[PDB]
Design a protein around this nucleic acid. Structure first.
Length: 50
DNA sequence: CAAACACACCAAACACAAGAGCTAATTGACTGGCCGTTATCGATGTATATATCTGACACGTGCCTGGAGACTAGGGAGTAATCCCCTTGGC
């Protein structure tokens, strides 16, 4: 499992959310126009019903 | 017939194998040639110890010269009487 976790971490170690509110990597290539397709931190999110 | 690319196959390598944390003990190069120091073997003595021969001193034996002993031969030195020459003595 450790080798898997290492390989995963090294492949996305530089992706981040720039102040333009978009997700890019070191090469400034846009990966997502908004973080998680919504632009919200995963901390303050709760399950709900429609 | 020769050249283009594609596919299947064979043959050759690359890199990875979680995070680490503690403790112990096995390995401590080696023949050989050669130079450089030094220990040893060897000669060439001069100093000291010992042996042979020569020289001076000592004790001892000796050959030689002169001296000494017993005994002898026979005569030199020497009593006892005598004469009377000559000396001392005298007026």
């Amino acid at each position: 499992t450790g080798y898997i976790q290492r390989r995963l971490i090294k492949s996305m170690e530089s992706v981040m959310v720039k102040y333009d509110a978009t997700v890019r990597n070191s090469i400034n290539q846009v990966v997502q126009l908004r973080y998680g397709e919504d632009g919200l931190a995963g901390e303050s999110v709760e399950f709900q019903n429609l």
